[PDB]
Design a protein around this ligand. Sequence first.
Ligand code: D0B
Ligand code: D0B
Ligand code: MG
Ligand code: MG
Ligand code: MG
Ligand code: MG
Ligand code: ZN
Ligand code: ZN
Lengths: 327, 324
Amino acid sequence: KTEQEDVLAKELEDVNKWGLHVFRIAELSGNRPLTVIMHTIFQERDLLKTFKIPVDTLITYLMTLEDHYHADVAYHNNIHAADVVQSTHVLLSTPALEAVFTDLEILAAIFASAIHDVDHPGVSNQFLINTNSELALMYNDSSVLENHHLAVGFKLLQEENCDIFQNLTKKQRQSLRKMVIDIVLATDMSKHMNLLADLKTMVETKKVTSSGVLLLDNYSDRIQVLQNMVHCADLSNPTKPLQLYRQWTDRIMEEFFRQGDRERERGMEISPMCDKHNASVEKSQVGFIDYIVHPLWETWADLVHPDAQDILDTLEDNREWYQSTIP
Amino acid sequence: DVLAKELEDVNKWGLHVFRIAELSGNRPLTVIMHTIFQERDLLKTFKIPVDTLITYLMTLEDHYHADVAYHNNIHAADVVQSTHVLLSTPALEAVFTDLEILAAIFASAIHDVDHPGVSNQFLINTNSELALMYNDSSVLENHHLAVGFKLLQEENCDIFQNLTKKQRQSLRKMVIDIVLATDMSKHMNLLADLKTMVETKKVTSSGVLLLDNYSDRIQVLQNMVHCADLSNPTKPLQLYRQWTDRIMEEFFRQGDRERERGMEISPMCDKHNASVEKSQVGFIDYIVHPLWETWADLVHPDAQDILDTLEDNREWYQSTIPQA
Ligand SMILES: COc1ccc(-c2ccn(CCC(=O)N3C[C@@H](C)O[C@H](C)C3)n2)cc1OC1CCCC1
Ligand SMILES: COc1ccc(-c2ccn(CCC(=O)N3C[C@@H](C)O[C@H](C)C3)n2)cc1OC1CCCC1
Ligand SMILES: [Mg+2]
Ligand SMILES: [Mg+2]
Ligand SMILES: [Mg+2]
Ligand SMILES: [Mg+2]
Ligand SMILES: [Zn+2]
Ligand SMILES: [Zn+2]
C-alpha cells in the first residue's frame, strides 16, 4: 500500500513466516516497511472489515506513524517497528493460541507493536534520567520512553483522517486503549524480570484442551500472554535467521555507541556496551542471549510447546556464531 | 502581628489555616512553608537562600488555582502543615534524616499543584490531554510532580541548588514516591501494606519505630503524607466544615460539566441529589477512619487525640441522619 516501482510481493509472501526479510521490504517499499507490513497484516486478518476501518484512513495513520520513527536512529527506527509488528503477527498465529484471542485483542497487540517505540530518540531511559531531560521530567523517571511512545501513538490518531478506531464502540475503544497501554508499558526492560517470573508461573499452571491449545480464563491471563508475546517480539533479533540478526546487531551497536559518544562528551560514565573504544560486540551478544533472550524464549517455547522449537534451535545456532567470532 | 500570633500554633494540629490565608494576603503556602523551613532549620542545613526559597514558594503558590474551591493553595498549605506535625510525632523521633524530612514537606507542598478541580476519572473519561499524556495512570499525580519540579527551573527558584548530586537524586526519588502515593487508586494497597507493617513493627527501648530499609522508610512517609492529605475530618469541626463546603462546591462543579456533556454524573457530584452528611459519614467510615486507625496503631498512643476528634466528627455528622 505504498508506491514501490517493484514487487516486493514475492518477499511479502513470507509475512506469515519467522525471518521475513524486513530489510529487503524496507528497500523495496521506499523505506515504508511499517506501512507496508501493517497494511498487509490488516488485510490478511480482515481487520478493516471487522472494525470498519477505512483503508485510506489506515494508510494515512500508518504513514504518519512511520514518519515519527526517526530516520537517523540506527536501531529504534521504522524497520524495528515493522519487525516487531510482523513478529507479533507470526506469534499470534501459533497453533497453541488458535482462537484464544478476540479480534480486538489481536488488533491491540498489533497496534501496540506498531507504536511501541515511536519517536524513539536513540538513547535509553537511564540516559534521559541522568541528563535531566524534559521527557524524564514529564514522566517522573518512570518508564520514560514507553509512556512517551504510547502518548505519541494515540495522539497521532487525532491528525486529519488518521483515526483508525473511529468506528469502534466507546467500550471497544476503552478496552483496546487499556490493552495497548498494558502491552507497551511491559516493553520497559525494568519490568523484564517481573514479566518472566509471571510467565514461568503461567507455564507451570498451563491448561490445554485436547488439541493442545492454551486455555486463558480472564483478562489477567490474556493480557499477560499478550504482554510477554510482544516483549518476545521486541527481543526476537537473536532468534532470527543469522543474516538478519547480524544486521540488527550492527544497528544496535551503532545506536549504542552514539549514546556513549554523548555520555563521553558530557564527562559522564559511559553506559555498559556504549563505549566504542572498549567494546566486545560478540561477547556482548552472547551475554545478551544467555541472560535475557534465551531465558525468556525458552519459557515462551514452554508455554506454546512445541510451536516455538525452531526458534529456540536458531537462537542456539546464533549464540554459537557470536561465540565463534569473539577475538 | 496577628499573623505572627496565629503562626505560633504552626506545630499544633488544627492550625487555623484559613485565618492565615486571609492575613497573609492569600499566601498561606508561602508563609507556612517559610515558617516551617525556619523552624526545622532547613535553610541552614541545606544552604538554601531565603530569597530563592520565597521566590520558589510564591511561584508554586501562584500555580495553585484561585478558582478551584478545594484543590488550591490553602489545601497545599494545610497538608504541608499537617505533615509537619506528623513528622514530629514522638514514635518517629530521630527516625528520619533531614533530607527525608525535606522530601516529605516538599512533596506535601507540590502534591496538588496546577490541579484543575476535576478527578483523574473525569480526565480519563473526557479524553483530556492530561490523560492522553499520562496513559490514564495517576494522571494528575504525575502532573503535580512534573509541574512542581519544573518550577525549580524558573529564575532564582532552585532551592535544591546546594544539595549534593546524590542528595538531589535521593530527594527527587522520595518526592516522586510520595506524591504518587496520593493517588486514591493506590489507597487500598497502601492501607493493606500499612496494616502488615504495623503487625510486624519493631521499636527501640525508648519506644521509637525502627525502620531499617528504604522500603519501610518511604512506606511510612507515603502513608504520612496520605494521612495529611486525608486529614480534614480529623480537624476541629469549624475547620472541617469549611473543607466540606469547598470539596462539595468543587465536586458539584465537576458534576455540572458532566451533566452538560450528557455524561453519567459521578458519585457525590450531583448538586440536586447529594447529601453532605451521608457523604462525609461514608468518607470517614470507608476511607478516613480505616487509614487513621491504622496510623494510630503504628504510633500508639501519639495519634489518639486525632483519632478522638475524628470519631467525634463522625458521630456529629451522622447525628442529623435518621437511623433505625
Ligand atoms: C541485536 O541486539 C539487541 C537487540 C535488542 C536488545 C534489547 C534489550 C532489551 N531490549 C528490549 C527493549 C528495551 O527495553 N530496550 C531498553 C534499553 C536497555 O536498550 C535496549 C536495546 C532497548 N532490546 C539488545 C541487543 O543487544 C544488546 C545491547 C548491546 C548488545 C547486547
Ligand atoms: C472534606 O471532604 C473531603 C476531603 C477530602 C476528600 C478526599 C478523598 C480522597 N482524597 C485524597 C486525594 C485524592 O486522591 N482525591 C481523588 C478524588 C477521588 O476525589 C478527592 C476529592 C481527592 N481526599 C474527600 C472529602 O469528601 C468527599 C466529598 C464527598 C465525600 C467525599
Ligand atoms: Mg519465498
Ligand atoms: Mg522500547
Ligand atoms: Mg488461567
Ligand atoms: Mg491530589
Ligand atoms: Zn522495541
Ligand atoms: Zn491533596
